[PDB]
Design a protein around this ligand. Structure first.
Ligand SMILES: CCc1c(C(=O)Nc2ccc(-c3ccccc3)cc2)c2c(n1CC[C@@H](O)C[C@@H](O)CC(=O)O)CCCCC2
Ligand SMILES: CCc1c(C(=O)Nc2ccc(-c3ccccc3)cc2)c2c(n1CC[C@@H](O)C[C@@H](O)CC(=O)O)CCCCC2
Ligand SMILES: CCc1c(C(=O)Nc2ccc(-c3ccccc3)cc2)c2c(n1CC[C@@H](O)C[C@@H](O)CC(=O)O)CCCCC2
Ligand SMILES: CCc1c(C(=O)Nc2ccc(-c3ccccc3)cc2)c2c(n1CC[C@@H](O)C[C@@H](O)CC(=O)O)CCCCC2
Lengths: 425, 425, 416, 418
């Protein structure tokens, strides 16, 4: 039934037939022995699933084991929201187990926190830390700052010239002009204080702005493009080298994120009664403080850590992020956390605990949050999509939930380490 | 039909009946009137899918939106390998779109590389970087080191005693004693030179060893347990404060991983002819090196980066990790990368590129790699499971692939920044 | 010698053995003698002789000099328990062509080749038409740590400081304590119920440490009136950061942030520096950026800025302990000119902590070195321009030092 | 007369006055660089240089108060300094006794910062009344960290693996060790960054700081490496991997020079009467300043109050390289409760990269030697090579801790200005 190549190509270019009529082996035969290239399988074929299936068959014959894809599932998944948006050369999907850790008592509310992980004991441990938090009157958090950044590098012909652009940007008149250009690109675009830094005839300019409920990379980058266009009108010798000169900084470790913040800067806290630490966490307060100082402060310091003065906030950040359609690679900066434990109340037997996380890069609109399964997890928290009355509130709430769930996860791993657990039981 | 609470209880305490003979609403009426806790749902119910179903039903009526879970899938998924191994309190699974970039021409072989992401353009950009490497003759990698670590903190009564223990561990006979205890806990356990650091009466002890094709955390922790128990026979006043004093360092940014290594230290390289840089990357070598020097080195320096001297290593690392059953939270350390670009060839128009990644924390057995869909992705690369013939070969191969694919994504992203793109197109 | 009863009854009429024997049988306490003796130089001699009696080598103080020094400006100012002085050889590297001027730079060092090397660096810069420089920013900082009952309370204080009216009353309290106290933008960080506050201000030509400490004093007291439950834990919570390696000094700057640059003709790199522009760029990329990167350095992207900074600081009465942060520097080298064969060099030092008044700039030997550079004392027609000028000179002299050593390294020097 | 004075230059220089030599330079019969030799004495060669310099300054009376007479320039010329125009007096104060390891020390400190010696001295008083401090040198080994390039990263991987084999390190150790009597190479640490290779040589240097000695050994060791790997370019003797006089985490973790630890318990009475505070307030300030504060500031290795003050003061006093306080001041200061009722103050400073020596450099000069002799660590130690330098490093750590106790007590007592 697989027709000759010259004939199949005619039915393809037929506007009232298309690949809908061609068989699987015929679409394959045209990719092989080049005619339809390979990447162009996306736009031609009838349904999205049949494109995934064809691409899987092509892929199977190139592999050293033909049936590698047998347990990689692809059927019945909604690919309409994925193609052209979230992923390319799609051959299926990867199911990541999702557990629940809660209720999380935070700001006089309750939250059932979804967490997608394959590390056993992670969700149970976090769930225990939530119960301890809940039995001690609950947690409270504050968003200290909010604004996604982009950190382009431009080049003037000399360091003195880039010193002049730095001085001009620092004047209130220069900032008003660059803020007009930036703010015109979108209704959420509101440029805050510019931070600049020189390295010879390079000039790194840190544009920061809130992005409503989106994480905001696409919004700040568009705002930055036009802003540097307006700056170029005043300084035509300027050469834009890159929209990112790693000064944002995005998806790399960097002290500037730790010190200036990026996206949402958050602080959570709680006071656990001496009873709850004993019963739920199987330790004392004196022991928790001892482990936290010498592990999370002194230990991190001996390791040469910048922004890693914590136990495992990266476990909780990553688990929520995958569950809620966040950019999981932004875990690199979003895990930044200092966990602090001290005595509280009369005997100095109650455990004070606070996690401060300067650079939670998060958003409840765009990216993976347009997909329905990760919209479901966002809906658990009540933060799905945009907030009309109070733009930004949903992404800020989710940032607060991340910091609170980190603190829950911190209480439980630190408690296990304090009561002598060396291995995953 | 829904029977009273006491009738349902004695059916649940019956052996040749049990939970199979109750309806969902009856089990839920038992949980509401506090006869069965939430965590007891795992061991009472017959099937795992029915346990996930009933946990979802309770969860839904605690939420502000009772239909929020509608689009979080849960059915027809193999929870036999998840319950009590990878996740707890399971309410479903989050599907991450999976894409393929390849062939990745690495060490005279070809790799179809799975990439689970929700960020648009990442799989297509990475795939273009692969094309540039393929038409450039290919890439070559070496594994420079190998050994997962654990960095426990112990406490001596005084600093003079911690110094005594440090000197003892540095003697070849004291080290032999501890290497015997450590190696006895597993067939892969081979303890390497002990790196130690004192902070007052604290002593941080960095145990390092290979772990076959396992990532190594369970195996190193077990070897660390017995090793410290032997050290205590020689120094009984020693206090084992925590199995991790953040010296390892695991899932936090730390300079020690950058300088000493953790897991696999790997380097990848390639020469991209000027012709390939022109037709695939749409830019010149000269423009590309200018961006790399001033973004990936200088820019990263101004930012105060330790080990983040790259464009988006974290994008590629994270995507391969989710797809292949790795711990995504370990992208914090595993993303460590310095990207170098120089001029090669006749008139300095070719592009020598290399990515050095000293701390890739990876494996092909254990964790999420026991799950069949994550195994499907590992089979794409011919690195699933353990190697009987040559232990470590699979995990070393996946680490070489993570490095070469990072370099593919570096080429492509850096080309796009060089060519004047400031926004995703 | 006379007995010990005739001496208690002034101090000028007694001998050195007499006052010593009063403390050696416990007649008089030792914290009395500071004021008792008339001449300052005999206070030093006695303190030495008392100290000789405790050392296993009595005569080890023999070649530690002490005579013919002006101790009047030091005592109750720069040093205590003074037993003499330490001579540090001063050399001169110049002339240095910087912003249409020439500078003979004094360098107090005991390291061989350092002054000759820096001096060759100046020769290369001179023959390439000199160096240019700009002060990018200027503000000494101080970073107290305060605590409030909860993290929610300290968040409230942070928000309060970020409004214009909160910053206005804090600026009112800060500016009141001194002439030069003009408070710039505040920077804050929270860690739980901790709150770190970075007060930045110019301070005339002084380095400013004590001035900002006074400004921070009244400013925290004002914040205490707004927030009565605020414990003031310390005036320095290491957030300044003063005399320790910190990323915040590198990123925000501290004291003077300065940039400096030069082009060295291809001919000059060949004949004076004995290398090639290409090779210089190769060593700079791979040593000062890639190498420092591998070593895990924050702000140490240079060859030996600290050699030059420390030498000038000791000679010019600066606080040499501040070389920790002042040495922060990134040396960049690029190709330049029509044939791409000329060597563009630039050093960027974001945190040079410096001044030309107060501290050890009060001493006459140190003021001699400051006068060489034409920057001594307070600039009367532009308060703070002498301190700016010395910072600029440090950056240009640091760049000269980089040129020479990197040229040496590139020509295969494993010496000295 | 111009032409008359040239004829006398051959017979000498001492039969020409200062004004006659200077006229010979200003109308160029002789260049500027011919003063090191022709002028017969060191003090008078400095004098003519100052006169030549004085005319080029906008204020020609600039150098009147820079001293130069009656100083030993012979140990300075061609070893410690060049283009010498005088010396710079730094006041030396004294802080002691410092009770360290069953001994007493009077510690010299060259500083122009008010209250530093007086405060360092109060910290000694608290330590003395607490029953003395203790200390241990945990490591010793100056490093050099050169950079080399091979054609490929694969080739540099081949060299790293070779340098890790028992036999590769044996051939290298032997070449390094032959150049000096103290040259004894410990295990190598290598990091690759592409086709670059950063090799960290480490060896003790007797009582010398070791920069010259390990440079010699590194040079020789790389020439043996070049014989096994001819395509290897030697880029630079330092690829900043040592790392010398720059902030770098490799010194914090691996150490460089003397890694040292120090400790002491300070009784409750002593904290209240000498230091005017409590153990509980000191602990609170130390946690939140030296740990949390430094963490918030992005500190690598600077977990202390003012270690750099003490290190700089002693270094300049004792003829050390004061530039090297960049890394030698790396310190973590820890305070916790101690004793039966948690009222005594355990304190410890750990300083992993103290770069120190008692022979060579500024320790060849006599005033600097006087300060070393006070401590009893001057010059080489014939019986136990290295022991004078280890003792000075222990003194630096103990004195720093005295300095931490004092300043931290002042901050805890509520003093905001000095
Ligand atoms: C977070 C998971 C976890 C745990 C851990 O949390 N265990 C735990 C605690 C409590 C319960 C529990 C549940 C319900 C009722 C009662 C009790 C169950 C399990 C433990 C370890 N890990 C892995 C840490 C890993 O992902 C990062 C670390 O490596 C980071 C670091 O600290 O360095 C490692 C071994 C040490 C302690 C136990
Ligand atoms: C990697 C995705 C990506 C790309 C990008 O790679 N775009 C791209 C390039 C090539 C093709 C292509 C495909 C087939 C044939 C021919 C060409 C398609 C798309 C671009 C950007 N980003 C986001 C990076 C983001 O996750 C981390 C950065 O923020 C990290 C950083 O550099 O700071 C950011 C905007 C500027 C550049 C383009
Ligand atoms: C800075 C002094 C110095 C020099 C050095 O600068 N030598 C030099 C250069 C030029 C002339 C000269 C003068 C007039 C006419 C012609 C030529 C004379 C001597 C050299 C080295 N050092 C010690 C660096 C030391 O304090 C920091 C380093 O350890 C820092 C680092 O690079 O990592 C160390 C060995 C390498 C090469 C030469
Ligand atoms: C180090 C000197 C010093 C002191 C200080 O120590 N003062 C002091 C203490 C005790 C006595 C004394 C003497 C004999 C008997 C009884 C008591 C006298 C004076 C003080 C300050 N500084 C300057 C610190 C400066 O160089 C680094 C810091 O800026 C580094 C930092 O902490 O961030 C600064 C203001 C705060 C406290 C007082």
């Amino acid at each position: 039934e697989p027709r000759p190549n010259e004939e199949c190509l005619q039915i393809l270019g037929n506007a009232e037939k298309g690949a809908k009529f061609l068989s699987d082996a015929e679409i394959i035969q045209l990719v092989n022995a080049k005619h339809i290239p390979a990447y162009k399988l996306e736009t031609l074929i009838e349904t999205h699933e049949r494109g995934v299936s064809i691409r899987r068959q092509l892929l199977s014959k190139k592999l050293s084991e033909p049936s590698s894809l047998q347990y990689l599932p692809y059927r019945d998944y909604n690919y309409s929201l994925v193609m052209g948006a979230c992923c390319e050369n799609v051959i299926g999907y990867m199911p990541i187990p999702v557990g629940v850790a809660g209720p999380l008592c935070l700001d006089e509310k309750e939250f059932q926190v979804p967490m997608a992980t394959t590390e056993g004991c992670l969700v149970a441990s976090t769930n225990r830390g939530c119960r301890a938090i809940g039995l001690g009157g609950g947690a409270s958090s504050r968003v200290l700052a909010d604004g996604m950044t982009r950190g382009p590098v431009v080049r003037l012909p000399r360091a003195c010239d880039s010193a002049e652009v730095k001085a001009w940007l620092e004047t209130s008149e220069g900032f008003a002009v660059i803020k007009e250009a930036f703010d015109s690109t979108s209704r959420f675009a509101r440029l805050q204080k510019l931070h600049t830094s020189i390295a010879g005839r390079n000039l790194y300019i840190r544009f920061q702005s809130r992005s409503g409920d989106a994480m905001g990379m696409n919004m700040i980058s568009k705002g930055t493009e036009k802003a540097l266009s307006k700056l170029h009108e005043y300084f035509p010798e300027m050469q834009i080298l890159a929209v990112s000169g790693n000064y944002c900084t995005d998806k790399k470790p960097a002290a500037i994120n730790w010190i200036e913040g990026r996206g949402k800067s958050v602080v959570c806290e709680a006071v656990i009664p001496a009873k709850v630490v004993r019963e739920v966490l199987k330790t004392t307060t004196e022991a928790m403080i001892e482990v936290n100082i010498n592990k999370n402060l002194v230990g991190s310091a001996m390791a040469g850590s910048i922004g890693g003065y914590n136990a495992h906030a990266a476990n909780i950040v990553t688990a929520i992020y995958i569950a809620c359609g966040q950019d999981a690679a932004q875990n690199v900066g979003s895990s930044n956390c200092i966990t602090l434990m001290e005595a509280s109340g009369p005997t100095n037997e109650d455990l004070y605990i606070s996690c401060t996380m300067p650079s939670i890069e998060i958003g409840t609109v765009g990216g993976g949050t347009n997909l329905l399964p990760q919209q479901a997890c966002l809906q658990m928290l009540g933060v799905q999509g945009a907030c009309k009355d109070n733009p930004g509130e949903n992404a800020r709430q989710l940032a607060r939930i991340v910091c609170g769930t980190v603190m829950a996860g911190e209480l439980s791993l630190m408690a296990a380490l304090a009561a002598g657990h060396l291995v995953k039981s």
